[PDB]
């Protein structure tokens, strides 16, 4: 029956990305902003390989990101949807039922501004999922989720419009 309680779409996780192009203090400041916003120690990402044009080298710490789950993820997400005035694009939704957007200033989110920290833009991505995804992530007896139980683009767009009363344009 398609209207089962366990088929309920719900957020699995939100991943926070700041891809500062350099190393040192600025990346440290991005980690500090992420630690302020999420309340969790973020993780620093190292370049997988070297590009001279971008001014990065392999294993130079370039970006920082953090993953939040549960009620806090919803709160940070709605704080970010406020900046977008609740208006996403059709393209912003992946074929796997995940969606994301990117803010340009982190003080629009509603945190204190510090001249020493400066402003960082921030990138948001949400992993959608119903109950039972642990099947594909548990250690023992790992399997795949059947096609009907999968999240797809249309179900997520309709769920987002209903739960947030927003509009997803398609320019």
């Amino acid at each position: 029956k398609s209207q089962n309680v366990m088929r309920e779409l719900r957020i699995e996780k939100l991943v926070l990305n700041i891809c500062v192009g350099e190393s040192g203090d600025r990346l440290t400041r991005a980690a500090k902003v992420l630690e302020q916003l999420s309340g969790q120690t973020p993780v620093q990402s190292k370049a997988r390989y070297t590009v001279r044009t971008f001014g990065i080298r392999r294993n130079e710490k370039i970006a920082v990101h953090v993953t939040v789950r549960g009620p806090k993820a919803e709160e940070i997400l709605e704080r970010g949807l406020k900046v977008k005035e609740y208006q996403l694009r059709s393209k912003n939704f992946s074929a796997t039922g995940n969606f994301g957007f990117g803010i340009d200033e982190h003080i629009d989110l509603g945190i204190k501004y510090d001249p020493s920290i400066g402003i960082y833009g921030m990138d948001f991505y949400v992993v959608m999922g119903r109950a039972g995804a642990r099947v594909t992530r548990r250690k023992r007896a790992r399997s795949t989720i059947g096609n009907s139980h999968k999240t797809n683009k249309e179900d997520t767009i309709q769920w987002f419009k209903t739960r947030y009363d927003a509009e997803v344009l398609d320019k």
């Binding site: 980690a31 973020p42 993780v43 620093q44």
Partner: peptide
């Protein structure tokens, strides 16, 4: 503090395929 660890076994490379400005 905490950093993502490497999963890609092509640890010793130089640049990357796919990269080639023409695309």
């Amino acid at each position: 503090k905490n950093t993502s660890s490497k999963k890609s076994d092509a640890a010793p490379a130089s640049a990357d395929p796919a990269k080639a400005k023409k695309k």
